[PDB]
From a paper:
Basement membranes are extracellular structures of epithelia and endothelia that have collagen IV scaffolds of triple α-chain helical protomers that associate end-to-end, forming networks. At the C-termini, interactions occur between the trimeric NC1 domains of two protomers, forming a hexamer of these domains reinforced by sulfilimine cross-links. Recent studies in one of our laboratories revealed that the NC1 domains function as recognition modules, directing the selection and assembly of α-chains into protomers and networks.
In vitro studies have shown that α1NC1 can assemble into homohexamers. We grew crystals of self-assembled recombinant α1NC1 subunits that diffracted X-rays to 1.8 Å resolution. Chloride ions were also present in our α1NC1homo, α3NC1homo and α5NC1homo structures at two different positions in the protomer–protomer interface. The very recent report of the existence of the α5NC1 homohexamer in vivo gives credence to the view that the canonical α1NC1 and α3NC1 homohexamers presented here may also exist in vivo, particularly given their structural stability, their proper binding of chloride ions for hexamer stabilization and their correct disposition of the residues that mediate the sulfilimine cross-linking bonds that stabilize the hexamer. The comparison of EA and EB of α3NC1 and α5NC1 also showed that they are identical in structure and also to the corresponding part of α1NC1, although no antigenicity has been determined in the latter chain in patients with Goodpasture’s disease.
Author numbering:
A (entry chain C), B (entry chain A), C (entry chain B), E (entry chain D): 2 to 229
D (entry chain F), F (entry chain E): 1 to 229
The structure:
């Protein structure tokens, strides 16, 4: 008996990701991370179908007031999408129109025969799946993010959405109602850090890491599914 | 075998909603959207039992400090509830006492034999349920809301709570610890917008819509349950 | 057939909690409530495995910027953990190193045969589980919390995380990247309040409560699992 | 008598330049800037000071720069806010652009004064008298703060002429964007000092909801005054 | 020639403060610190006449919307006033009506012959006035404050408002539109700290201070006027 | 002539003391404080006022007290922000501590003036002339606001000398912490008044992204002026 358990997967590229072994495709879409309306951020759990929308837009929502008037793309609102490895233009100027497409991640919504969860090692080692559970994928421990106005959202640490397959310092792009997208200097990604068991309660040693050593302090994860 | 999957439904009226096809009643209540304490908003997923409380109050919570003192209805805190089609009084003054009753939406918490999800078309078209899933209800794509201090919360786009059966410009009412409720000019509802496939990457065309044309730009949704 | 449903339980003590009736242990850990990075709070549902981390740290995360530079414990960021009955030191000075250990709650992540939920009475009386659901535990209705910058997070009222077995005016402690933990005067806990059925729509009667009468206005809850 | 260079700014709340009040002299005119909002953070100008009077209007009067030595102008989602005129919203209620913005923007004068200038507030429907030895520049209504997008905003110093607006307006300011649009939005709030009777100071305030024809019954009055020399 | 320079003084008691030597009285009032409307704080400079209102109220302002409707004391807004040495009631419950009077500070707005400024020692010693400037009063260096929502305001360090004559850990009280006032556990005062010249560019030594030793780390100030 | 005690503060944006402008005399020197952030809320000092000039630097120049009569100094996660020098970030990009912080911190002078001091802004690349009867103190770039941690920050009064920085810097301030560290962070933004053409005031602004070598092509100029006596 298939009960309709769900798992969402994000390619972090322009390609449709395959559903992991033992699961089946329902539909593909574009990777929505969060929206920002009237300055207030609201995010989707990356492990859930709500992060996977059939249609992209820089402005995928509208707002309505108590006077029964609705406004679409008519203020200063934002959308944020998981992004591909596509580099910023040399100009560093905002991206518009069809030029936006190579920057947006794709996703799969998959039906699973059992419950799906994430486990985190908090080390450079891959955490094993709990006894009785098999592996769907391995990745990096993704916890939260901020951009405009230091607003943002985050992930549930037991959800597959907290286990991104590709580590990226800049895993999302910012888009506006006016039709532009860009990366901005205030965009932060937050990842679970590595911790040695002996050192749990001791003062953390501050570290600043550069390209080539970023993942030396990033926790690893595995997305697992109950064997039936 | 029943595993205890749940779905919550909101009437957006004074009457109890009926449980959708193939599900059974657990209990009814009043439709809690969010609370705001010490200026900070915290919302409930409208698809979960947490948005359905047995008892209403303008102040359904209290707060406690590190000095072991608790305070109930003794500051400037808020509660927010899904509302009915009841219009504002002519006076536009705050509503009190038994006069609040006609304004508050009812809900049903129902047990389901399988997982329940929402899908969104992002068009005026009704999106079909995935193959193998049956229809529970059809509605309008509800994403987030803001009120006092531009604080608020939103819905999980995979949850039944992101699919409201009646579109309303003003779908919720603001209540206070002091016992008053009202609609305020800064109350905003946010809904997923309609997008044309060929125009996904193009600049959104701004639109200001009035009564009669509001739903011409509102995404449709369907709530679905795996057939067993 | 075991589908891999999950329930997380928090001892609110230095000891591992036992898995509730009819469930089995997956792993134990420390009780993570929320994190705060670049001043923005992000919480974990206390009913989910995300609130149960194998390894403690005052700084369990790092951040990365668009210039491919990551920083660990190198700004002014926070972590928050459910706490034990351990009193503040007489000095009221921040706690460091091994002295932190007696303050941090433990958790168990447990595999269940069926779905788990919480129900709330909104009275001093115990709410019964729905028919066909078995009792896992009884507690107090925990909704929301705030600390530094009045930032915080909250619980899903349908989740076991909204049902804490021991009432505490101060149920959580604040930790910092610099390695210190403490209770601060601005730490607030929010709980569901008691409501009389006949008085639902009436003006709430304000009340200030001291030690000995704190629980007289705190809603009770029960955590329930579908009988299979 | 030495002129030390005391300043007072006046706002017409119309498309026409205001005149400098009696006993003061014009320095320059401009447009009435209320506040700006960059990276979601509001920062306001005291309406009594020359900082609220800019020579050139724009929907985007500022740019931002980052630690990587890159600056961006009108290239995100930032705002500017200006005191507005009696011009009504178009019936479409759609954002205003280009030259259609001009009728909505208030004008200002920066004036040199021979002495210090202050505002006083009655907290009644009556005009408060100037202090002994001070003469009147203008009368108006007690303006304290305002909010718009994200409930961000700013306010006035109650001793400043900026807290004393000559025309009462439920909606005294308009919102503009980097993209070139301006509009009134349903979340735009103006805050004014209320009328308080001396007998009711330490009594529970009586809640009141007021409509057109009735609004100013609860709005505090003010006078802007200048020391006689 | 008297040019009309102003200085405002706060008694921090129920008594009218006297205008300092060389100055003359214009009027007296009650000490307004800040207001909070639609959750946004806006403060008055304590050295200026704007912090001295003729009439007290728990709600000294109203708000108006774009529909030409104004609301007075009809939501959840705040006012904050400098307070007296009057202790919190034993009950710790909100204070109403005439009972508020013993808690509210008084002020004087005074005309001065010349400019007035504050200087700060950043030591426990009184800083001398600049040469050519004479003393108005001495005090403690007051910088900022926070209360509900961790909103607040602060003082200009060149203003007499940054130099409070009486040190208080809780120098202000919180009032509400509903007519209640109280001290709350999240109310913070911030003061300039004592810094020794040779320790300026060293790691600050953390310190937690109790009653009897609070002022050992509080910077002193003097308010001065140019001799003419 | 009677000296009434008008004040003007100047910031070197270097480790050298700035000189008081001609016509003014020194009161004292110090370090350039921009703003503080306590319990996550920012509060700034007007850079034109003596409040922005503290005798003694510290990474933590304040403490906080609670209603239980307990005060805490450098015992949470609070911040201070200071105007900075041309000193580059170290190659490691790691937090700076101890005496190594000194090369990064700007110095300031508090000066007594015989008359009122103001700023004017051109909103072009040209220097705006002082008003009639006002003499020049310095020229600079129009600085309006700034943000850092939590997108909190503060700004300048556009009539104040604080809105007129003598040296343009994309990163004009550094962030320090109660724990004793300072650094530049990727989210630190500076906001400057932009150049506006008179013919383009009401038109849609043209978006621009500028790199090193062209940053100042869109930054407004200013002059700080003093009334002649
Ligand atoms: Cl928009
Ligand atoms: Cl940027
Ligand atoms: Cl309340
Ligand atoms: Cl309203
Ligand atoms: Cl840190
Ligand atoms: Cl504290
Ligand atoms: Cl912009
Ligand atoms: Cl609107
Ligand atoms: Cl109110
Ligand atoms: Cl409290
Ligand atoms: Cl600190
Ligand atoms: Cl950084």
């Amino acid at each position: 008996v298939d009960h309709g358990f769900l798992v969402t997967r994000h390619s972090q590229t322009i390609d449709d990701p395959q559903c992991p072994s033992g699961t089946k495709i329902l539909y593909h879409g574009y990777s929505l991370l969060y929206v920002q309306g009237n300055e207030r951020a609201h995010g989707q759990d990356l492990g859930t179908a709500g992060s996977c929308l059939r249609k992209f837009s820089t402005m995928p929502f509208l707002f309505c007031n108590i006077n029964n008037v609705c406004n679409f793309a008519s203020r200063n609102d934002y959308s944020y999408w998981l992004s591909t490895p596509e580099p910023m233009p040399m100009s560093m100027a905002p991206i518009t129109g069809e030029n936006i497409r190579p920057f947006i991640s794709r996703c799969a919504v998959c039906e699973a025969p059992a419950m799906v969860m994430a486990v985190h090692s908090q080390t450079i080692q891959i955490p094993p799946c709990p006894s009785g559970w098999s592996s769907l994928w391995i990745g990096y421990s993704f916890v939260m993010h901020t951009s405009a106005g230091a607003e943002g959202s985050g992930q549930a640490l037991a959800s597959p959405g907290s286990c991104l397959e590709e580590f990226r310092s800049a895993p999302f792009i910012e888009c506006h109602g006016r039709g532009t997208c860009n990366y901005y200097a205030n965009a932060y990604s937050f990842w679970l850090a590595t911790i040695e068991r002996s050192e749990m309660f001791k003062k953390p040693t501050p570290s600043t890491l550069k390209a080539g050593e970023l993942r030396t302090h990033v926790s690893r994860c595995q997305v697992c599914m109950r064997r039936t």
